[PDB]
Amino acid sequence: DDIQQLLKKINELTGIKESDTGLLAADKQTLQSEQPLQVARCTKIINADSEDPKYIINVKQFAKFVVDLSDQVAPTDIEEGMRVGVDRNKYQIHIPLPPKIDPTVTMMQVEEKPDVTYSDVGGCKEQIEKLREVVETPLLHPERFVNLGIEPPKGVLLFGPPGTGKTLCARAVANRTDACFIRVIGSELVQKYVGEGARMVRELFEMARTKKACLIFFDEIDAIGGARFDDGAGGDNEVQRTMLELINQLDGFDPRGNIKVLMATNRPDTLDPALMRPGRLDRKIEFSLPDLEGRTHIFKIHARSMSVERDIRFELLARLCPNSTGAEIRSVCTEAGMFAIRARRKIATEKDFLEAVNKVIKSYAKFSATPRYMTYN
Amino acid sequence: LDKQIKEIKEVIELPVKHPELFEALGIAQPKGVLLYGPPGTGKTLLARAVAHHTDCTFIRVSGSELVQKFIGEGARMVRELFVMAREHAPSIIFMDESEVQRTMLELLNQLDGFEATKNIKVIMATNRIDILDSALLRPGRIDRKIEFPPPNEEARLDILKIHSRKMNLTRGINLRKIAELMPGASGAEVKGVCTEAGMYALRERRVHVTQEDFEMAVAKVMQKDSEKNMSIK
Amino acid sequence: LERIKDYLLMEEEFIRNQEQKQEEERSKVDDLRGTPMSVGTLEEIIDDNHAIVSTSVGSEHYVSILSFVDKDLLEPGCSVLLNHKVHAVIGVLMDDTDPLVTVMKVEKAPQETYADIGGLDNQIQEIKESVELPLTHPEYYEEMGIKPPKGVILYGPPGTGKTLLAKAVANQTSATFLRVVGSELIQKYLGDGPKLVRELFRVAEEHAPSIVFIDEIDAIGTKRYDSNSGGEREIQRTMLELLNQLDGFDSRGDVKVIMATNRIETLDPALIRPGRIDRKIEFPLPDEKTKKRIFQIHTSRMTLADDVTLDDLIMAKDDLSGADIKAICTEAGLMALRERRMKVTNEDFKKSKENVLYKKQEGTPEGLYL
Amino acid sequence: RYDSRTTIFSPEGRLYQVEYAMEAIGHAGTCLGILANDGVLLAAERRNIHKLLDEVFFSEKIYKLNEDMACSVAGITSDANVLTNELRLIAQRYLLQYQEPIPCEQLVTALCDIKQAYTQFGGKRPFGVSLLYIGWDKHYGFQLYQSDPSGNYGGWKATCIGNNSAAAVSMLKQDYKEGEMTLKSALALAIKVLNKTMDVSKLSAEKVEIATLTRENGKTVIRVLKQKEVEQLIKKHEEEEAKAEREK
Amino acid sequence: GADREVQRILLELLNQMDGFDQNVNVKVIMATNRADTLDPALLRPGRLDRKIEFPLPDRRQKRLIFSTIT
Amino acid sequence: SYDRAITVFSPDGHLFQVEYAQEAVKKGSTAVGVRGRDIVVLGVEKKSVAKLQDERTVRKICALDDNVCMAFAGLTADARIVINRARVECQSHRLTVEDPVTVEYITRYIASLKQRYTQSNGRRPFGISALIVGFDFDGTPRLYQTDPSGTYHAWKANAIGRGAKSVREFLEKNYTDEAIETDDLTIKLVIKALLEVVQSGGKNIELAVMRRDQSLKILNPEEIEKYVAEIEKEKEENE
Amino acid sequence: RSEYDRGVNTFSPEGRLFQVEYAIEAIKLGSTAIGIQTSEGVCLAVEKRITSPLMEPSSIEKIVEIDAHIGCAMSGLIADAKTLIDKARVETQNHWFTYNETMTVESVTQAVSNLALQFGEEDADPGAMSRPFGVALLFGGVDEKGPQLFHMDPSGTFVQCDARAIGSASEGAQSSLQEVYHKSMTLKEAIKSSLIILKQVMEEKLNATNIELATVQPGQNFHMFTKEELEEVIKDI
Amino acid sequence: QIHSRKMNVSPDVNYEELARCTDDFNGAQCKAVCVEAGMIALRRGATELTHEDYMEGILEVQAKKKANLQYYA
Amino acid sequence: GYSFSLTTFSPSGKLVQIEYALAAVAGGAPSVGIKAANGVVLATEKKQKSILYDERSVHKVEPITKHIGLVYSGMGPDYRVLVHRARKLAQQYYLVYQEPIPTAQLVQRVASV
Ligand SMILES: Nc1ncnc2c1ncn2[C@@H]1O[C@H](COP(=O)(O)OP(=O)(O)OP(=O)(O)O)[C@@H](O)[C@H]1O
């Protein structure tokens, strides 16, 4: 109780301290001019007329306004189908407005480069090769394709078991793309308003068209309504419209033109048939569980950073992993280091990995990995 | 159901009235009640009676799922109900159903015991305990699982007297025999015997209920079902 | 009667929290700012200082900015504050996250350290190496070359106290702890719910070291089954956004995820994979030694008769959970109070176990058969 | 899931179809037996009593299988008729080969091996019948046995199978005395156990079937008590309850 | 389960039927020949208090129906 | 692939229905066996007396022939069938070859019967893992165990049934050349190993001994108690 | 897979036979066995992988004697291997009985394969072998032609191999074998080579209990249970 | 043939056999076999596309993938 | 999965297919049997769907032995098969024991069929 009193006394002391403690030219001349300065609400012109132009503008939700040009403007500068700013009080186009950037679509563009080389991805040479000629070689050297008169697929679908490396390869392509890479946020495409997301998909293609040669990565295609049950309830009707808008813009009545689309799905079966149909996505690069040479290579790349005895045999460790995804092989390397940290040995040994191989695969409830059955030897 | 009432009083009335006794004991107050009866007789009467004699806010949430991810509202059935119970610190919530899985999980996280103020006692009163999820049945979420048995011959007499209080029973009526005549009654059935017997008098245009009227009513309330040649086994 | 001092400490703490302009420069800004200021998105930036600002009414008029403290913070997607009438950008953009995200952040953990938990020591070791140890001693992981495991799943039968480990982590964590149920993403509006998952993660990155607890993850992500009837849960889209945040392009920075499920088989394979849950922790029903520590901890702060045999209750009955042990201890105290004895006899504990375990009926004729 | 074929084994090594059949025995007339020093007894509940049904057949749930053995059947009616015939056949087949009445444990093991086979072979469903065996053999004396649809069997001083078996087993375990059963006392235990297990009030003679096996003059004399004999035992139990009144 | 949702309706109706405005009783008349919604709980006194079974018109009852229609 | 069907394989390569049969063995009462220089001994647990039930009928340890005895762990009825077939073969081996069945032959016969059920649908693999301990002609003591998979192995000492793994770990440390030194010391090793997983019941043990020159005898309950007391005294002496 | 793996009766749309491939997978569960054929003779080496100290080493039979001139090594299901091993033992003796001569290693491999092929003939012993066997057998023997090593697979397919590996780590062993094997290798050189490869591909250290070795050469008989020389050869290497 | 008109197909290629192999193929998939065959020849640096290159395209379009499996040889 | 087979047990009660067979028996022409002190009288409702059907052709009450007769309610084709088998078993008894089959025994033998 005395110890509790000491804390209460400490709180009382803090209360005494708090009570005792209690006991640019922009903000100058410019403000006087700024308050009178008038506003000009943005609006979009749809048409123009002879003699008095009488340009009629839809504000954005208000009305079609027949507004004459403002006195201090050039009639030629105001143009049909051009965003403009109209003062509410003077009801005239005081100043024209530059075209809307639509920043949310601009945000999805990667802009930065992920620092992953193709070297880090391992055990999938064939999958890398297939991606190289739909992503890097057609863009880097189109002449070879033209010589055989063969068009590039212009579309790729990466599908495989989870943790295989589909996205890891995609970030590697982004590192050396030498062309705009547009990662797409799947949730962003779904929107509260009906078909608001569909409008965004048109913008996505429009942005892609403006840039010359760009690759769009629709990771998690299932998020972008990648199914078309389209039942009578039509709960997914808004998303289904968004999916169809992507399909038409992707191909039909003039397709991507210079856009290569990379789509990655853990479950390929769920994807809607129209998207799966080629032309929209000509290549079907499925990633697969790595073979023993691949399993050794993934172990070597993951363990190169870790400090370990030089005599460790990755081939034995890979053999002990019968069907392991790349992520699980990475999990063995990290777990092996954690066991060495637990015993406080700075340099790990082969035994540490074997304990990890049991922990990452056998210890997990795989059941097949842990054997209690004598059955087979 | 006097023993059952006392257990209900221990879980709800005792912690709220005397928090210090629990602190002195060193035991955390019980926060869960489940009332389950195969007939289920008396489970609401206890919950409604607790509601009259409570001295605490009583919230009744026997409704199903209209909110959550339906076009309705979000987290109304569970997150909102607990927040309202927080505003009134002495609060008891009576649930009459395990509903849609996401909602049931939200009830479990609210009932886990993050309520430092607590003072929230849930008198869940649903029959068919077997169907109920083990996580809901887990003792921390529901401390007590009181069982309401079909009324015993003594109990049936007591229920018969309670529902015969206003009836003008003629002298010579044997209430004890009438309880014996209906075995394994559902209690509500004992209430039924009185209502049907009174109607026999009403059709006869008399307010004087008689022993025969109770006996005839016992037969009318009682229901018997049989099938023939399916008596294999 | 030392309670009065403790109550005073709590009241004093609340008072302390309750007790937690320039002569000309501030007054000029006060005049410049409107009595009501409306906050709206910034759509376009123009060098003249008149920048297009989007609003709920959509008036995007270019508006001058005169911010005394700084006007260089303007960015696309920033929520600028504008005068109700003039609509000019008043000054530094408002910087507050969405309200639903604010509720998750937890500053006070009721439970103490791992001391209350008993017999889950192996489970404690795993949570510490993934959560507490990397922050306390970052050098060890770098020297090994290992990158610390960032994700953990706690899976166990009901009442194994998986949540208790999470409460213990909250008690001793440098990282801000965001406690979000998996069932707290029921947003009715199409969209919004996957966006809320993005919001929780962006806040975690803003708070730098952070621990995310998602109790009852079964609701947010299970199976990833097809639409079937065509109702379309949209929950699968929400889970996919969480899957994207944990390991879907970019990086997770320094955010650690703890997730708890009564049933782990139902959870979809992609979510429960290395890279989203590097370490997996299993809580088994307590055995005998684990039961002894739990029984002692629950009865530590109560009157105990010499007659009571803690070992007898633990050995005689096998199957009771850690929560069940606490319930037996609370029930035993109530059993004694019925006899008006504050002290608890061995008889009370024996009666208590029977009352708590009446709903648990298991097994069929599997006795003579094997 | 792992149901249908008796052949499939659940991931927990459980044969659900066999388990379902063992649970099914519950929906059947109560059958109970007491070992009884100097005797043995089988008691059954005659369910489905109706005014029109004749009940001409001697017995209904009690069938002799040999000069010195008998069984009471609880389970699917058709399966019972199949098993009773086979049990009768095995008894005579042993007599033909060895000219001695079959030892009781052996008759039970043989039917149990047949019942066991149905569970191991895919085509057939497991038998839905469980039965109690009363007999005297020179090797082990008076014995009582129980068989299960699973094919497992056991020897019990007292046991019950149909309807409220657990209630009878609980009543039997407390009331039964080892070595002091003394036949007439065992008959009383049966009437008292029957009153508790049956929901029937007053345990009328028609509802109960009692068969007693005794060794008289070196010859087993299986007898099914007539209604008048059953009635006197019921009246004695009722009188004993009247003596219990006031004292209880 | 699918069937569970229909069961949820039976529970919701049972909760409403319980005791409704005693004196201003909301009398409920049910004519469903369905055993699935005919749970013992619906048949319990306090829910469907009175049960009336309608026999096929026999002689005399038929004579009345025929006379009225003719 | 599919768990339900004895013959369907799995993409990994497993006949799951056979493995599901092994589970029934684990749920069976624990049984242990040791190979002694002259006294091979098998121990059983879980007498599990049921009050009004006679225990002569329960027979977890059943002899197959004079020189060979067996203890089953798993479904009781399936075990009765395998024991009887093994008993018939032992007599038939004497009719076909006038020499007593070597222990290996009867274990190979039991393995073959078990494998034949595994091979085709329409039959359920037997849920038992019998331990066969006996002395062959030429007086060599041997212990073998048969899995439900139809495999058979020879073990110096082994445990089957509930808590078999715990008993084996105990034997790994306890089993030594010294322990089999004396006939009583071998009986003691079975009792000590059985006691660890038999709980504190003590009475719930039915160790049976094969003299390897005489016949199988089930130890008297009193004799078993005397060994248990002797073990307690030795533990006290160590303290 | 994607269905069509329910029976060997069904055929894949691709035309592949599933179940036969699944049985080929079962061999991987087996311990590695390495066989090298040289003019001096055939050497067979196996990883015993003893599960427990208590279990007797002899009961695990990874190398067995089909006949004096033929020895076999099995990776895969133990029970399945026994049925095939018995047939080879009866057949070698029956060929002696009918033809008074030693059966060639290739002919025994062919005879065993004939039973292996009947995954579902639907005529032979109906109710037997409804599924493919899961064992790969390496048959090493010296016949009239000379030392010969033959590998059979669960699908009834057999081939003569100068050097071969079966079981888990077979893939690793084969790659090592191609580098080590040469036509002039002596049996002694091959025996050292097999254990060196076995040590690299087995997690446990190659102690004498861990590895069982066998050698059949024209001058001697089966001699396929080197005993206590398992210690001698390992120590020298 | 219509899609491959631009590409330098060998005269040896027989479209009818390829068509018989491509059962249940949508027209776009038939175009895909031609497009992939051109890249497959490009990978080996072939001046012209042989029938076997077209067969490889059919497998890649089906995503079947091909390898020696034994139990076949 | 249950109610489609008689080879599998109900996951609780009894095989439904036998109960469905009882439903077909219930959908049958009424059959009344009255045992009396000196005899047994059996009867059935034989109504032809149309006047054309001859009432002197197939007979619902058919003798099985001189002293034994059978009546049926249920599917008519199935009855003829058991009418023949019951009659045959009565003849096999006469050949084996030279006595007309007792009625109780015939019922047991017919039931086994
Ligand atoms: N072949 C590989 N080489 C290197 N690292 C790999 C490989 N495969 C997986 N990884 C590891 O797994 C993670 C990469 O997973 P990635 O980003 O490809 O997503 P994914 O899990 O395949 O996608 P999804 O969840 O959609 O199935 C990283 O930890 C990476 O190091």
Ligand SMILES: Nc1ncnc2c1ncn2[C@@H]1O[C@H](COP(=O)(O)OP(=O)(O)OP(=O)(O)O)[C@@H](O)[C@H]1O
């Ligand atoms: N002991 C009793 N004394 C008097 N009336 C009783 C008694 N028990 C039950 N009743 C009457 O019968 C009704 C039966 O209520 P019961 O609990 O069976 O169902 P309910 O009202 O739907 O509640 P719940 O859903 O919790 O079971 C009571 O509401 C009351 O009207």
